[PDB]
Structures are given as structure tokens and as C-alpha cells.
Symmetry: C2
Subunit: 333 residues, 2 copies
């Protein structure tokens, strides 16, 4: 017997990454102009878009001889990148060490540990250069650990490179008809890699980012200056940042918009109840951003709008899908 990929038969979990569904939306986008499609990155085996980053960077390190059974992968992550790296590390027999901040719910920490990762919990509300931060904890661990790599997704050019293929998929799945893409920006690797592919096929495609309140990204996109007044703690994970990642290519992004923690959380809940799509916090942010962009007039009857849904609702049971947590934030009565 042999292994056929159109029979959906696979020799490695790594082949269950990429080529995710594009699904047309009709209900959550009711009464907007144009057609709307969701790129469902939760269908990756690791349940987020970060599977592509982890695969691409691990395979690159393997090709460079830097990883063998027993080697160590170190990374700073709020959850998804660490999960994908720990998933691959479990398969390959790598030691995986993740620095995570306590902004993330304990659910994500226990997922990482189920995959066999060593987790270092770090205080969230410290400066990036504070030696207690999850950025600096991971750099130390890397320096102290021989036969280790530091993925460093915020400053690793392989990150947006891995999402060139995401853009290729979006381009082919819309048959070259896409006019706008809406993508939340964390490291910025997803939006930038997508933008690189799409702008090369058609520079008129509008690349629209989503930012959080409390993040420096939008202001930097408009002024190219890091404004500390823009930075303060917020509750959405995986969107926005308290520093400027070089993984973000600000020159290919046409516009940024901010969405509140509250509206993103309510929109994630509304998406689940309306479309049956049980998606993560940033998917709620992304759909809310589509609503805000639409009210600002970005789309017309000829628009072909793709919105990236980065991860799955099952990782947010102690946040936006917990009525107690929502009440405690004041997002619901």
C-alpha cells in the first residue's frame, strides 16, 4: 500500500499544515457590500496559523543541521507559536522550552505541558527589556542551553516568509479576484507574508490590519515612531504589541484599525452563535474590524474580502467563552 495526498493519506503530521479552507460567509456579514470569505487557519493540525511558522522555521533549522533528536527549541510565545513548536518538538524528539506571560490563561500553559514542553511563566506587565519578561527569559535560556535554537518570531524574517504560502492559497482560492484582505497583526508575519504574495500578483489589493487598544502598531504604521503613550495592558492575546517587531512589514500594509477588547469578545461570541464558527479572540477582532472597515466605506458591491481567522475558540474557554470572565471585564451584564 502507498500514501496518496488527494486520498488525504499522510506519512507525517507536518503535511497536515497549510492548504486550509476558504469559507464564504453569509450571515455574520449580512448587509455588507460585496462577498466575504474566511480563511480558516484553525484547520491546521495545531489549530492555528502558527503551525506554518513553526514548520517553516523548524524545517529550515533541520536543513541547516541545527536540530537533531535531543536538541532544544526555545521560544517566547503567548500560546499558539509555543503550541505548534511543542507539537513538532514532541514528534521530532526535541526538547521544547517556552517562555509565556501570565496574560495568557492557564489553559494554554497546560496544553503546552501536555505536549511535553517546559514552560516558564513570566509577569506580563513588565517592559520588553526587563530581564523578567518572556522575551528576555527565553533569550537567557537559549544562551544557557547548548544545542538550542531561539525561534524569536517577533524578529525572525522566516516568520513572514512562511506566510507567503498563505497568500498564495488566498490568491488561488479567490481565483485572483480578491480585493481586500483583513488580518490581525501580532508579530505581523501573517499579514506581511500574505501581503507580499498578493501585492506581487496585484498591487491594487488592499491589505488591512487590525490592532488592539494598548498597542504601538497602528501609530507606528502611520508615524514610524514608537509612542509609549500608545502602549498599555489589554486583554486580547495575539494582536498588537508593546514593541515594534521587524517581522511586520509596514510598507505593504495599506491601513490599520483598532478594535476594543470588548467588541472583539462580543463579536467572537456572535460569530459562534450566527455562523456556528467557534473561533478565537482575534477572529472576533478580525470580524469586528471588517464591520468597522465596512462602515468607513472600504468595500463595495464588487469587493472580494478575505478575513483571516487565526485560531480556534476552544483555547478561550476561560476568557471570552466564560460568562464569568466576560462579566468581570464588564463586557456583559
Amino acid at each position: 500500500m502507498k500514501i496518496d495526498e488527494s486520498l488525504n493519506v499522510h506519512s507525517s503530521l507536518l503535511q497536515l499544515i497549510g492548504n486550509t479552507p476558504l469559507l464564504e460567509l453569509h450571515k455574520i456579514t449580512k448587509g455588507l457590500k460585496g462577498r466575504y470569505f474566511a480563511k480558516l487557519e484553525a484547520f491546521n493540525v495545531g489549530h492555528s496559523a502558527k503551525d506554518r511558522v513553526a514548520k517553516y522555521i523548524v524545517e529550515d533549522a533541520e536543513r541547516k543541521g541545527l536540530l537533531k533528536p535531543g536538541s532544544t527549541i526555545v521560544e517566547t510565545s503567548s500560546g499558539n507559536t509555543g503550541y505548534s513548536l511543542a507539537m513538532i518538538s514532541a514528534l521530532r524528539g526535541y526538547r521544547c522550552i517556552i517562555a509565556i506571560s501570565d496574560k495568557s490563561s492557564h489553559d494554554k500553559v497546560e496544553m503546552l505541558q501536555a505536549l511535553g514542553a517546559e514552560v516558564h511563566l513570566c509577569p506580563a506587565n513588565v517592559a520588553p527589556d526587563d530581564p523578567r519578561s518572556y522575551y528576555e527569559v527565553a533569550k537567557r535560556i537559549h544562551n544557557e542551553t547548548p544545542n538550542s535554537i531561539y525561534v524569536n518570531q517577533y524578529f525572525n524574517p522566516l516568520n513572514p516568509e512562511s506566510h507567503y504560502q498563505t497568500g498564495r492559497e488566498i490568491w488561488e482560492q479567490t481565483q485572483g479576484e480578491i480585493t481586500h484582505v483583513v488580518v490581525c497583526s501580532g508579530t505581523g508575519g501573517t499579514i506581511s507574508g500574505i501581503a507580499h504574495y498578493l501585492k506581487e500578483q496585484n498591487p491594487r489589493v488592499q491589505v488591512l490590519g487590525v490592532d488592539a487598544y494598548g498597542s504601538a502598531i497602528k501609530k507606528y504604521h502611520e508615524t514610524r515612531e514608537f509612542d509609549p503613550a500608545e502602549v498599555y495592558p489589554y486583554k486580547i492575546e495575539g494582536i498588537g504589541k508593546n514593541l515594534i517587531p521587524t517581522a511586520t512589514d509596514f510598507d505593504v500594509i495599506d491601513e490599520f484599525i483598532k478594535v476594543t477588547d470588548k467588541d472583539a469578545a462580543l463579536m467572537a461570541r456572535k460569530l459562534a452563535r450566527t455562523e456556528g464558527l467557534f473561533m478565537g479572540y482575534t477572529s472576533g477582532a478580525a470580524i469586528q474590524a471588517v464591520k468597522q472597515y465596512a462602515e468607513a466605506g472600504k468595500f463595495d458591491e464588487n469587493s472580494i474580502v478575505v478575513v483571516l481567522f487565526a485560531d480556534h475558540g476552544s483555547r478561550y474557554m476561560n476568557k471570552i467563552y466564560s460568562d464569568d470572565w466576560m462579566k468581570k471585564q464588564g463586557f456583559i451584564d
Copy 2:
């Protein structure tokens, strides 16, 4: 622009059900004879094999005129079937009412509510005919509710019928070479529908079921008598039963084997750490059963063994992937 299914472009979430991956395993099955493949039903949009049941029964009811926007779908479920029905009910605008027993962790209840389902929590340790049970609570709600259906998966012949296609996939994905299939049996719909397709193509295919300690299924399979001594509370959800479902076709199942709550939980954890496959409690049971069947001599160097992995690890964060819960059961020190 048009919608192409090999571009993975879809007009409805319902098309993201079925045609799941078959993945060859090399590490968890190290040193067993033959080749081993996992059928990954967690890749359904609803993250379990029950997506197929829900789709098939809803579409059948729609074809029969029994469901329109505002109609009500009632079901008895421990989690997965209710999730899939609530997911579809959210999309279609049906009211979804689920009777669930408090054997299920509160995680599953909150997932159901995120999809907009009305949940009735029921005491677990009551007889099936006790009016407090989740079987009888759902039948009452159905009788009290006009424009409602009662899915009744334990006694609904559409249940194993929906898994005829699962068997067809397994048959094509192994190119007709499968010699054994290992499937946990709850309602029995999955194993029976799979067995119906496979035995019709090749009656020599061995259909091997997995049962829990505390369930009547294995004894009934061997004696065709319901033995109450076989029934007592246990911790694995979605395998075994305290009654005899007619959804189980005992005549196509070659053998049953029991796995302990402890070994299934440890094997789920070992599967995650070894293969990076983060799967549910019954996947741990299924892999443990493969180990037990292998030690009993069921497989040789020419065996082509498919093991069904029914759902995803992310639904078991408060059980087998919680070190506290495992310590409390005595499964780990």
C-alpha cells in the same frame, strides 16, 4: 468568482465534515507488527466524528420537511453530538436543546452554550429510565416542544448509516489493504457503519471494538444478555454504555476489549508527547486497545491496522490533561 472544492473553497460549513486525514503512525506503535494508521476525525469542523452523525440526521430531517428556521433540535448527549448539533443549529437558525449528564466536565457545557444551545444538566448516576436521566429529560422536552425533533442517537438507525461513508474513506485511503480496524464503541454508530462498508468489500477485515470497565457492551456482544453486574460508573466519556443501543450492530463486530480509565488516560498523554497528536480520552483508549490487541497476537507483519481517533484533546483540559485531576483519580502520583 466561483467555488472550487479542490482549491478547498466552500460555500457551507457543512462541507467541512468528512474526508478526514489518515495518518501513518511510527512512534506510538513502535515495535508492533504491521503498519498502523490513525483516522483523524478531529479534523471535522466540529472536532469530532459526531459531525457526520449531526449532518446526516439534520439533512435527513430537512429533506423530510421537519426542520425550518425556528424549529427545535433536541438531543441527549455527553458532549460531542450535542456540540455538532448546536454548531449546525447555530448556522441554520434552529433552537438546540441538549440534555447532558454531570459526568461531563463543565468545559463541554460552556462550549454548547457558546454555540447558543440550551443545556439541561442531569445527574449521571441514575438508571436510564429514571425520569431525571439525560435520556428521559430530552424525551420530555421533545414531547413538550412543538416543531421539534429528537435525534436519539443511541436508537437512531441514521447514526450508523452516517458512518458508512467513514468506512468508504478508510477503504479507499488504505487502497483496499486494511486488515483490522480498531474503534471505540459508544452508541456503536461509528464502528457499525465502518464495519458495514468494510465487510461488504472484504469480509475478512477484522472489526475490533473497545469498551470501558463499567459498561455492558462487551458482555452483551459475547452473550447477547444485558448484565447489570457489568454496569457501574466510570470516567471515560463517549465509550461504553449503561444500556444496549440499537445503533450498535453486534453481528458485524468481531471482538470487543476493555481498557481501564487509567490506561486510556495515560495513553492519551503518551500519544500527545510521542506523536504530537493532541487527542481525546477515547483516542487514548483506542491506542491502548491496539497495544492490548497486539499483545494478544491479533496483528502480524502483513497487518494494515486503522485506529479511529474520535475527537480532540482540547475538550479534556479539566480531565486527562489536568495533572490535578489525574492525581485525584490516582492515575499519576
